[PDB]
Amino acid sequence: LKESYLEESCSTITEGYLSVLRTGWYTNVFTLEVGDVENLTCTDCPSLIKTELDLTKSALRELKTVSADQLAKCDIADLCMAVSFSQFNRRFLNVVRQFSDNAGITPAISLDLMTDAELARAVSYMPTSAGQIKLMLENRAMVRRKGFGILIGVYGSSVIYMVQLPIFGVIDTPCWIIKAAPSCSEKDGNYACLLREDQGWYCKNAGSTVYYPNDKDCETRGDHVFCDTAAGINVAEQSRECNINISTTNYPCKVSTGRHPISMVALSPLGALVACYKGVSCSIGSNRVGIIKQLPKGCSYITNQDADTVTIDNTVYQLSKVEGEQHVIKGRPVSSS
Amino acid sequence: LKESYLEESCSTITEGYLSVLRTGWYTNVFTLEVGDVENLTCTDCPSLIKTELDLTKSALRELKTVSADQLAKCDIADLCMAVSFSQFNRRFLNVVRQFSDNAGITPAISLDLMTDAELARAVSYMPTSAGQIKLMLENRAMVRRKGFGILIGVYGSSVIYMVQLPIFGVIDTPCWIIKAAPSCSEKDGNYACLLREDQGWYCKNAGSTVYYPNDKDCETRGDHVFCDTAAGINVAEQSRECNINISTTNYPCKVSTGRHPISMVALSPLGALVACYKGVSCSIGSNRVGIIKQLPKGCSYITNQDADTVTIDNTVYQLSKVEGEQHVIKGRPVSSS
Amino acid sequence: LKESYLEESCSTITEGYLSVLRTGWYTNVFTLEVGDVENLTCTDCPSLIKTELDLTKSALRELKTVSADQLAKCDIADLCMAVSFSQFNRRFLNVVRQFSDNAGITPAISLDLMTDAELARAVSYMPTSAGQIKLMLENRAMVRRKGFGILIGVYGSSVIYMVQLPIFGVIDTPCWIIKAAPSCSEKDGNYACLLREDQGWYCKNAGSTVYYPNDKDCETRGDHVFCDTAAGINVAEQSRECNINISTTNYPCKVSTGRHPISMVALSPLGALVACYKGVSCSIGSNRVGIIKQLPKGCSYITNQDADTVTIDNTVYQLSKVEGEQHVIKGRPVSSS
Ligand SMILES: *[C@@H]1O[C@H](CO)[C@@H](O[C@@H]2O[C@H](CO)[C@@H](O)[C@H](O)[C@H]2NC(C)=O)[C@H](O)[C@H]1NC(C)=O
Ligand SMILES: *[C@@H]1O[C@H](CO)[C@@H](O[C@@H]2O[C@H](CO)[C@@H](O)[C@H](O)[C@H]2NC(C)=O)[C@H](O)[C@H]1NC(C)=O
């Protein structure tokens, strides 16, 4: 992580990341069964286990509608079965509950569709070099969050669904992020604003550079950006001379000339850009002293650790997160009997 | 709420909203610990409580993989423990269940990570004036949704996670929404369409106006828009003369000249725009009478309460939501024995 | 499904789909009430049912904060109530659980807010012709997903919420998808790239064509695209001569001329586009033999069934999903006593 301030265009580039990109989809098929329940002597009467079985049977029947392939007297013994049924058959119930809640597909691969043991084995079988496989196992919280389970169908008392794990093929390719703010000059009152429109992520692969334009498109897990190959716009590798020289007469860079000053604050990974002109007062302050200085009229770059808040005409911006309070909560004890 | 129809460009502007913008992030750290279970004689022999404990231990162990800090016989007394364990330790299990379901992070702050009592106290401690704090307490429903919990790690039988509440610094700043439709003139069979491209929200703050271009970006809660400061494009405060005069020779407004007529319907907050030319028949009708009139060839604005359905060549559009049926459902009674 | 390769612009169009568009919103109001529990003698002394009731009361009280209307010893008989209470009042608890988890609104209509019997009846009452109603019943999986429940408020022991089902008015209107890749010509070492910008979905309705520009906007369910009428950009029906002839002097097609070659792979529904120039070696290989051939320098279209992997300078792309392993899992049996 190393953020550089470019004063000729009022923008910053942070080049310390490594890119991991998806290059296909894996697939596993699961079949979860309810499990045998010992026969009841009565077989026709209201019992806690029978009511529990009926609810499970009814839940499966309703769940069959949201599919993809085909459709679209108290006794001590009874209590033990009712509790035992919901304990031994817990993974099955959770899968049924999750699919019903999301109505067909879960947003992410929870730890009930595919346990860790099944996840590690699946990753090791993917068609990628050893380098990619090692990285995926190191941080498997992202493969789960990038996949999505799909319900195939329901037959009898079993459930069939697909996981569709992601597959990463390009890893450890250096890349950066670019943030820009307006840079308006002035002669006698008539301004000339130049704002760079090539703002967002920027990562390289396969002899080309991708341009995920939304900061939310690519997640961050330290020195790793888990970009999704669904919004990236491929651009020529020559689209880097803009940083060195905005014009450079070589690669036309996307800029938007203006005529009216704009005052705004843009937050960077390790700082923020403060630009304000002609009317609004700017100042940088911390949680200790809020009178550090008044920013001069222009585009100024302030480090994250140098200041904590920037007030653009009575509007704090909180460069960095603010820590609150820590709580510790413990449940009540479960005494015998 | 007051919608105005501008006939020189076939667009409408609604000026009745108040803006609420985010200016940072808060943070709280929680540590939920499982309750204490009294020593059980004959730990070797299975029991309905040992099985429940084993499932909890297994669930926590799997949950450790998706983290961020380090990784990535039955007696009457026995039954009470199984029921009691899941009752006293209800908050802990729900937090474990939610994190496992979403695989590491919960999309919103449910009412198990942070109860109302904890949420109210945290909001009162934020670094914002009394005005902002009062508003957040008044409607805390749109605080949990904008936030998101993060699982830090799992150690022993305890779970550590972060909430990261949002912080609002700019409130009660009036703003509006602009919707536009094509306005094509006819000249001896030759058309000239002019469709505005500055369509979306438009809110003001810190001597500038933001331009969230997607209606889904900002969520409305009456006379309040909880816009997210992640897609807003800052624009000059002079970007308002377009409504008064499309050209105005002052702020170049984004328009897209065309040559072929386009027939479409745009739904405004309190009405809709109906444009249809050269071939498709327009008509406005209600659920009572559907022959109110036939709209003339051109851009026309119809109030929400004036009509309910707009048919563009046999395609009803349902200006406003249609109410269905109300159901009342009660669960079966529970009787002793 | 029929994919055509257009060599004059290095793009492909697939014309085999049928459109399904939303034209309003439906609405149902539900009121779920907790069941009646027979009064238990000695309410003062704790019991496994009183604790269960207290948790339910506490859960409802907290849920009241996230609303929209107003705010923002153990015996054998006792155990049966605790188990029976959570069985009969299963739908109510699930609705409470879902609303609390999502903090006010559920992303989709799970199978606890509206059962299939209620959903089928509601769909039959929508104000649409018999043709639209028949389609919605046939595949109701993509009705719950497009809808979303809303919690109105909590009064006493009852819960009131709204479902807001979607309504489809335009069906069986043929439409297609267009994917394009750079087509750079070489002239004495000087390149001239032409990449189409009219990339995405393209569906027709009401004498106009919509242009959902994101592949994720429209979800495919076979020969049906359930596009959401929230991002569609209406375009003239004459915006189709681009495929036949790029210029055609009638509808200016959106292209972006360039000067530097770009190498990339675009995945079409039934194939992919491979373009690579001046430095990176292309090759197509299957899971059987990976030396099928080396693609020549240019824009080439390869069928999905012809090859499985595309390597752009040591980067496999996995044209089609790769099948993994199938698991069958059964829960432990439950035996009496
Ligand atoms: C950035 O690029 C501009 C554009 O080419 C450079 O300005 C040119 O510099 C050359 C000298 O190498 C002159 O012959 C041209 O007349 C200049 N043109 C213009 C429009 O200024 C500039 O030198 C480059 N470097 C910097 C720091 O701006
Ligand atoms: C909107 O702006 C246009 C452009 O400035 C105005 O049209 C001009 O009006 C002045 C009179 O003040 C004339 O001297 C110019 O010749 C006009 N130019 C053009 C291109 O029309 C227009 O009057 C303004 N008002 C309205 C309602 O359009």
Ligand SMILES: *[C@@H]1O[C@H](CO)[C@@H](O[C@@H]2O[C@H](CO)[C@@H](O)[C@H](O)[C@H]2NC(C)=O)[C@H](O)[C@H]1NC(C)=O
């Ligand atoms: C595609 O459109 C272009 C543009 O009109 C056509 O090129 C023209 O063809 C006419 C013949 O009908 C000539 O008189 C013009 O001089 C051509 N103009 C240019 C710029 O080439 C072209 O023939 C059409 N068809 C194809 C296959 O490109």
Ligand SMILES: *[C@@H]1O[C@H](CO)[C@@H](O)[C@H](O)[C@H]1NC(C)=O
């Ligand atoms: C239980 O009884 C049913 C009654 O039809 C029978 O089919 C089944 O084989 C018996 N055993 C189990 C384990 O369900």
Ligand SMILES: *[C@@H]1O[C@H](CO)[C@@H](O)[C@H](O)[C@H]1NC(C)=O
């Ligand atoms: C059981 O007793 C032992 C005695 O050392 C103690 O270490 C252990 O924590 C106890 N277990 C429970 C569940 O109370």
Ligand SMILES: *[C@@H]1O[C@H](CO)[C@@H](O)[C@H](O)[C@H]1NC(C)=O
């Ligand atoms: C139970 O007793 C209460 C008195 O506290 C009474 O209000 C209620 O009607 C009785 N019946 C119930 C709870 O079913």
